Amino acid sequence: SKEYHIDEEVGFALPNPQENLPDFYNDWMFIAKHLPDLIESGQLRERVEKLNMLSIDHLTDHKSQRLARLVLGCITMAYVWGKGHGDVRKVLPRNIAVPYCQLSKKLELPPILVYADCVLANWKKKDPNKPLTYENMDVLFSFRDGDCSKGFFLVSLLVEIAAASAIKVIPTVFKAMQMQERDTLLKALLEIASCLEKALQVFHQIHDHVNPKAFFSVLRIYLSGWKGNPQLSDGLVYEGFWEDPKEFAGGSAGQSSVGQCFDVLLGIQQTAGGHAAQFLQDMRRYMPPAHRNFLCSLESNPSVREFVLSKGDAGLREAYDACVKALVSLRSYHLQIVTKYILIPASQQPEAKGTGGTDLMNFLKTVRSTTEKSLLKEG
Ligand code: HEM
Ligand SMILES: N[C@@H](Cc1c[nH]c2ccccc12)C(=O)O
Ligand SMILES: OCCc1c[nH]c2ccccc12
Ligand SMILES: [C-]#N
């Protein structure tokens, strides 16, 4: 849509990703599809090292290129972390690193597994005729058995899909403001709030499909990166591409465009900077180039917040606040998820840091506080 690559149904997610790569890249696909066994047996690192350097010229279309990022990304996590108990690799082999860095530079992403790879491009629906729902859906790749990566990635994707129904309304909002259509704008804001209220109901599903203790110990360490990590302090070195090591943050739904999309829409100045603003601005370089341009386009438009405040209209303020309260609800709920899935598990292991690399609990509360302080009320 307007070459921002936002689908009506699935939003920022890649609609119907490719499952198979071309025959030339089978050596990659065998390692990626059999990750749980190769890590467990302990021949994952041997297979990656004994591997030819494959050129990325044969990947024709965009879906082929992104599938390769997902394939190469999951292998890079598997190689660096290994069994995930302590033993790590600081150097990444030239035969896998150089094609991955060249592919990453083409798509304007960092050479590391990101939200766009492991959530947005890491899914398939089982029956094409059936609708988008957890029973019908499945991921393409997993790290280990009992990591709960299916339940984890698909619930993130299902909320992304829930937010898509709000994202398609955004043109109506800016069209109504320009054309000076009060009733259209009020209806559009209420529709967005309704869609954001529904995304919170989709969020409830995470308790059914993700074990807290299994998520923290097993899956979290594979999603982690190497930007301010004590295990890789200097960072990872990509052989035959850069001389020194390079630091790149781990995967996180901080790299989701939906969070910033609606804050930017509603004039919630998160990136206006401080400790928390710095992080959210950095995450846009881990987003795809098209979605980075979408968040650009929203900031360029006239402020929806300024428009609503000027009119002296309790109806518009209600509808505006409905959207803002929905965001406060999502962020209030997301903190309860963090309490269950990080804080309580972390205390059982004989300010904690997230995969993105932030003092998470004070970071998230600052972000929620900024959202809550944007409620208009009586003007
Ligand atoms: C077990 C599940 C989850 C955990 C443990 C978790 C944890 C965190 C943590 C620690 C942060 C702070 C940044 C960082 O250090 O990475 C964060 C940020 C964020 N998370 Fe999650 N998260 C989970 C699920 C979700 C889901 C399902 C979504 C959306 C569909 C989401 C959206 C976000 C967003 C947008 C941010 C950026 C800050 C903000 O805008 O509020 N998270 N998450
Ligand atoms: N940031 C989370 C991990 C996480 C949550 N949602 C994600 C989506 C994709 C990749 C990683 C994540 C943590 O520190 O535990
Ligand atoms: O931290 C909560 C995640 C979140 C923030 N804003 C959103 C908008 C839609 C869906 C999820 C979120
Ligand atoms: C959410 N990371």
Residue numbers in the entry: 12 to 283, 285 to 362, 375 to 403
List sentences quoted exactly from the publication behind this structure.
It negatively regulates cellular immune response via depleting Trp and promoting the accumulation of kynurenine pathway metabolites. Here we report the structures of the wild-type hIDO1 in complex with Trp, an inhibitor (epacadostat), and/or an effector (IDE), as well as comparable structures of an active site mutant, F270G.
In the IDE complex, IDE binds to the Si site in a manner similar to that observed in the wild-type complex.
